[PDB]
Structures are given as structure tokens and as C-alpha cells.
Amino acid sequence: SDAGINLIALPAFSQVDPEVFAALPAELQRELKAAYDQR
């Protein structure tokens, strides 16, 4: 059940709005890129 956190926090890669990802700080971007590669 603990898997529910990332089901909401990390939407499918194909659904990410590029303009939203670009508005994030660089550290947040790297944190998200790293999390998507571990899926």
C-alpha cells in the first residue's frame, strides 16, 4: 500500500507538461529524472 505515494507524486512520463517541468528548480528536475529512471 506504501506504493500509493509515488502513484500520485510521479505521473506517467508521457503525461508531463514540458513547460511545467521547465519551471522547476534544477535540483527538483534532477530528483524527478532520477526517480523516473528507477521505475
Residues that bind another protein (CB under 8 A): 2, 5-6, 8-11, 15-17, 20-21, 23-25, 28, 31-32, 35
15 contact choice in another protein, Ni ion, none (CB below 5 to 8 Å, kind-dependent): another protein
Please give the C-alpha separations between residue 12 and each of 3, 6, 9, 26, in angstroms, as whole numbers: 14, 10, 10, 20
Residue 36 interface partner, choices Ni ion, another protein, none, CB cut-off 5-8 Å depending on type: none
Query: Could you tell which of another protein, Ni ion, none binds residue 16, using a CB distance below 5 to 8 A set by kind?
Result: another protein
- Count, residues in the chain: 39
The closest of 4, 12, 8 to 39, measured between CA atoms, is 12
